[PDB]
Amino acid sequence: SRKTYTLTDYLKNTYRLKLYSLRWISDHEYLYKQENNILVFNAEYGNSSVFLENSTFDEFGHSINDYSISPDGQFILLEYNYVKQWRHSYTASYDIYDLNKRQLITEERIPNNTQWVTWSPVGHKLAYVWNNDIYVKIEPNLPSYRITWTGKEDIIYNGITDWVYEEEVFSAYSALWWSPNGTFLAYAQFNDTEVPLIEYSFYSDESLQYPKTVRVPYPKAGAVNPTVKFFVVNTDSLSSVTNATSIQITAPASMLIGDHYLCDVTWATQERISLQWLRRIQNYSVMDICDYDESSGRWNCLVARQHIEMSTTGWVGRFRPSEPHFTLDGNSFYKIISNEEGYRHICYFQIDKKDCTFITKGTWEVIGIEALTSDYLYYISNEYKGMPGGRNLYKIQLSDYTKVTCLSCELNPERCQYYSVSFSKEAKYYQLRCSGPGLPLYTLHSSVNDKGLRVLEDNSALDKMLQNVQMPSKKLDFIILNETKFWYQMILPPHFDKSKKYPLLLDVYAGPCSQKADTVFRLNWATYLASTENIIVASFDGRGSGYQGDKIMHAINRRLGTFEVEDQIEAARQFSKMGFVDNKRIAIWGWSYGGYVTSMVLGSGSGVFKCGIAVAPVSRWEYYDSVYTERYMGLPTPEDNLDHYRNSTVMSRAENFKQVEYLLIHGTADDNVHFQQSAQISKALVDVGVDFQAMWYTDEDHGIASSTAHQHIYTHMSHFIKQCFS
Amino acid sequence: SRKTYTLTDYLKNTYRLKLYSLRWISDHEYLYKQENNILVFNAEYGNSSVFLENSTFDEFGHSINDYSISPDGQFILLEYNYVKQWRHSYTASYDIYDLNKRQLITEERIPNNTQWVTWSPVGHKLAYVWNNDIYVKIEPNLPSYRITWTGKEDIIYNGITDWVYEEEVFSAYSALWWSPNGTFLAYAQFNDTEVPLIEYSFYSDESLQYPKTVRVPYPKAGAVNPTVKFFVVNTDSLSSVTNATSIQITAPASMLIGDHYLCDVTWATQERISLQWLRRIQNYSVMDICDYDESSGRWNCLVARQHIEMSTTGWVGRFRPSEPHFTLDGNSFYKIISNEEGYRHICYFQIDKKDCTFITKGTWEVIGIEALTSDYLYYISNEYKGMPGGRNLYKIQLSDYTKVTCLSCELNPERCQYYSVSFSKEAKYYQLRCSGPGLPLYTLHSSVNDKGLRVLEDNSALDKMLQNVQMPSKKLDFIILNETKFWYQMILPPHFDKSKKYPLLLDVYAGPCSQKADTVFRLNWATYLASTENIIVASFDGRGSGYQGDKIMHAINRRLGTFEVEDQIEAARQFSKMGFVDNKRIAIWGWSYGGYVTSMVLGSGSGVFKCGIAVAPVSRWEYYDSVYTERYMGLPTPEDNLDHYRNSTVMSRAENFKQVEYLLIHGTADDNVHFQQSAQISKALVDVGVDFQAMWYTDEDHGIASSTAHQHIYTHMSHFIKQCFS
Ligand SMILES: *C(N)[C@@H]1CC[C@H](C#C)N1C(=O)CNC1(C)CCN(c2cc(C(=O)O)ccn2)CC1
């Protein structure tokens, strides 16, 4: 009939998804920014007004890529001169616009090249980092107060994370946390003094005669890690002639005994803060609860009021220990932890009591706690229909755990099976975001009766466009591997005929706690391969997968590169045994961890796969960062796990590549997974006489996301797959 | 018929060429090494004896990769622990062996990591460089005399060249010159203090956790160059307590006025040395002839003995001003210079007279002066049959320039048209080396009558093998473009049929003063392409080509990337008009300058070529080194030749690559043509949306010559060509 979803539709993004990104400014109003003007909406009735006109800054003389209204409704922080750094960090220029007098504050403005900026939770206080030092501005137009003086590029970081903490433990650039009402400002300091540096070339624009060398503090497995220190300062007792005084919170002793990390800071009350520490051997973590001492000024963390979280089967937390949610009086909290059965559920704690109480249970897991009222506890879980790849919002009554209600399950079971949620300040209202299996659906509700107020966006426009295109379908099912069931998904070509034999591409990631089989609606490269090239694209969640309990997830503990690749191979082998797969044309590909798995599978000598594509893969764990690698592999020492670090490299399987067609791709400026990793893969293949294909992307990083490089890499990969299958 | 010359034959070197490398130790004898022992031959009769048995060093305990017998016959220098650096430079360990007492010297031995070592020209003195300083040994077993104390890594070089001087001017690591009888030791000192560094990553073995950054002083076009100083020391006037005094030889003023180079040093007599200096604008060069002053100890270079060499059409010399050949008394000399008609011929000079007298003339060129007696001057030229691609030995009478005799022309006109020669100490005997077009043939002759004494090697063995294989044929001919004729060669498939239409591969280099069409016999990749794949491999010498006079060579002055690439297109366009060429399958490939040209040709938008391969190409001249680049391009300033520098880049033609299949290959540790150059090419292609093939070779340099890499790249390229043509 009509056309198919082509490679150009994907690259040029002709079929666009509509979103509904709102920013709650209260328990009743949210701002719905548009391509032009920002509106303010009344959640209850839906009426709206204009918060500030698009023309308001026609003559700002700079392109504004982001705004950040103070919790005051009094000021607007304007971000411009954006310059991306790593995955989360970046620098920019900031201007404060006074909403009152509609004037642009021109005095004592924030420095250019500022690293981080954030308002206080309540007032209009400002805290920012610049040149690695922390500054506080009690008033938009008032002079700033330097809180720290030790900041030093690539060495001492105050209020901001270094490379590894940004990527692997905080997933943020910021390392500062205001107290509930803004009185205190807590921050972290990182010392990269002896951390080795990764060095690589950056060629820049053509006009650069000499390539520059980029050097950054990056600790590879087994190397010297950065050290951290926590501090708290009172933003009210700050003079303007005396240097602010920061109180350091240290220990615990079970942590200070060796290398450790700071993996979480959460304020309980206005004078109570919780901190979670993790040993370098991420087997054991400790939460300290510290209270402010009025007539002392310092903070005390009572031993006995601390809680230990450890595992004997694997590491702690999914990626790190979960975050606690404190009750009004801060004398108790709720947090996700692994069951005695290995399933993650909500445990209820009394700050001075060792044993907690699980308020949920079952062979499913709580993905996260979304909101806590004195009445109910709202959380997301994959309980419904026993599908680990589904996400639903549930509320449990704190007075009767026996009373848990599903708020998303039945809204539209056919179209919606994967939800995310966004509550207002007091959780009076909430916005549900459905992202599959049907077209993304955004709606608004009220917590009191859980009444559906209205549809914010149903993507009806895209719906109309897609009915004139031959789209692929998605199969989400499971297979059985010795007692246990493992899920998978397959993007099936239009007019799928189970009688016919199709070529198959295994799309892989498979890193610990990952999930490639779900109910999410996507418009990606796989859509095109299936719609236009009639290729089945499958993904399988084997041992190591998350959201299914620890027996499965911790199965690859200390053994990266074993079961998770073997299982990907076993899936393929079983997919071909379903009858609609041409086992002479089965390929595999992945990015980053997926690149590692792809390479390991292709070098396994299974002969199952004809060809494969590895994009920015890890080739050996000693090349990757410590925080992530060590979490699963332990330490690369003969006393610990060295032997396996050495047995799970790609280069040792070089000889086996003689049987396959391989495409190795990598960005030269990858700061995460260093080009080095592929450099060594290609070298081992050359030393063994194996022919293969390669492609480097100069000055591109781990995402290979610039507009041009992105279109080029997927175009190159399409050709490779088409050639391998035709 | 039987079999063909396969890719494996080329890669595994199954069909070995034999050589007869001899070393003249006197005017009557020479040394001829064997895989085992070294023999000594009597040129007159041919009888030989063993100089030193192979077993001699059975239990040396070290793999010796090179020997060096003193011009004494008394000692043998043993080279081991060899470690390569750039094209000519390398470090190693050295042990001396006393052939007199057949003892291994163990006292005061040469240090490890020695950068260079050389015997004096007559006795058994030794001069070596270590840690950038010069040392002298009057006796193999005696304490060494330090000569210099300024040596500093990557900064000050004594006795050895820096990167650019090694590659572009001296084509050697060595920068020290012994006087004829060994009395004086002259050397050059290089200062790279402000020379920018090229930096690139070296991955090393898999075990290396953090990649290393290599940094070498390398001046790119227009950058700050290294400065040079010259000194001469009397190695007979050394105490053992006094830090020997080096006498500096400075200027000339016409040189000191700005940036310049030392491009040649030649000793005239025991007390007369000659130096040649060149302006950074390699248009003007001054030669100084200096004399040792007995009651001064210093050296004086009399203006009046200095000769100037300059050019108005281009640069001076083929790659540098030619070297002088002095008559016994050092009162006059001969050297190859450009004619008034633009052809290089031998000119005769009186050391104190400005004007010289050409002793040869014609529309052909003297390639080199090989020997000089009181009676004759022997030289190589391409006069015979008027074909620029042939080489023959000639001897001219000093009494009558009218009497020039060809000593190789007729020895075997069918088999031999390309000669080189090696004279004995007093030119009483000489060995001729025919390297094509037939199999290489080595013979001996006596100068008195020019009588052939005997055949040294005729490669009869290799001849027997090759008869049982279908070898390709070689056609050397020319075409005519506007009055002028340009030569070309084609490797033709076995049983070539001018009626049939064959696919054509244009093997290109085309650098200024290059020659790809000659009568040399070669067993290489092209041999495989033609023999086994039936592909015609052609090469064309257009504008910029050498050995045909300046009109042709200087055509591209200040204009690289113009006529030389255009002509290569014209040649293909001309070949495809001979009838035995499938104009639908014309490919092109090259290395270094050939890579550059191939890239410019593929980006020309000519429509003539279907695909191409560029290996380690130059992409824009500002990225290449100053000495070579500025020699033809001048300086990259708006006051000089900047506009053309910006007009001859490969990336400006990115768009046009849409019409061809391109393969970009580059070693990552290329210290000569930096990976950066291919990195900017790939970026321009990505940014323009052009698809292509690439392949990097980790830790490989300009030659990509490691055993495995070499086999790998030719295998990869073969697949590419085969695919493009089948
Ligand atoms: C590739 N994925 C590399 C090598 C293998 C290892 C894994 C898995 N890699 C990492 O980069 C590890 N770091 C994390 C776990 C990658 C996934 N991740 C993440 C975060 C966001 C976000 O918005 O915060 C988005 C996508 N992926 C967290 C870091």
Side-chain angles (χ1 to χ4, degrees), chain A residues 375-413:
Chain A
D375 214 328
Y376 288 89
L377 185 280
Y378 301 80
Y379 69 91
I380 297 284
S381 78
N382 60 1
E383 173 175 34
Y384 196 64
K385 251 65 172 294
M387 321 199 305
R391 296 290 189 66
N392 280 293
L393 179 58
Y394 293 75
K395 73 173 188 172
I396 179 170
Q397 194 188 80
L398 278 350
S399 289
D400 190 359
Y401 304 157
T402 225
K403 297 187 177 182
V404 19
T405 305
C406 190
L407 304 165
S408 64
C409 293
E410 245 60 55
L411 293 180
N412 196 331

Side-chain angles (χ1 to χ4, degrees), chain A residues 87-88 167-168 171 509 592-593 618 624 628 672-673 702:
Chain A
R87 187 196 294 284
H88 305 292
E167 179 76 3
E168 315 291 25
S171 285
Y509 188 64
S592 194
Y593 201 99
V618 168
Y624 202 54
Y628 178 93
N672 195 324
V673 182
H702 196 58

Side-chain angles (χ1 to χ4, degrees), chain A residues 174-233:
Chain A
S174 71
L176 61 66
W177 306 266
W178 285 99
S179 61
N181 72 24
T183 301
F184 296 106
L185 178 67
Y187 64 89
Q189 183 191 75
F190 301 103
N191 198 327
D192 275 27
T193 285
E194 290 194 299
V195 172
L197 297 106
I198 177 55
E199 302 175 294
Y200 57 89
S201 296
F202 193 75
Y203 308 89
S204 190
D205 295 317
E206 195 187 322
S207 60
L208 238 205
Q209 200 169 210
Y210 292 78
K212 62 192 297 290
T213 301
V214 176
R215 40 258 303 188
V216 37
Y218 183 121
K220 293 174 179 288
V224 165
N225 271 337
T227 56
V228 61
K229 280 177 181 179
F230 198 72
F231 296 94
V232 189
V233 62

Side-chain angles (χ1 to χ4, degrees), chain B residues 487-499:
Chain B
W487 299 71
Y488 72 80
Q489 66 173 46
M490 305 187 348
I491 304 307
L492 302 170
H495 307 121
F496 175 72
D497 164 32
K498 57 166 62 290
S499 195

Side-chain angles (χ1 to χ4, degrees), chain B residues 34-71:
Chain B
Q34 300 199 187
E35 205 201 310
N36 284 300
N37 43 57
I38 300 174
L39 301 173
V40 59
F41 284 85
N42 180 292
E44 174 73 309
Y45 306 110
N47 54 309
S48 61
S49 301
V50 170
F51 190 86
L52 85 307
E53 228 64 61
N54 48 245
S55 61
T56 306
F57 303 113
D58 287 319
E59 45 199 67
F60 175 60
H62 288 292
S63 180
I64 305 171
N65 69 297
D66 223 314
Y67 303 67
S68 189
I69 300 178
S70 72

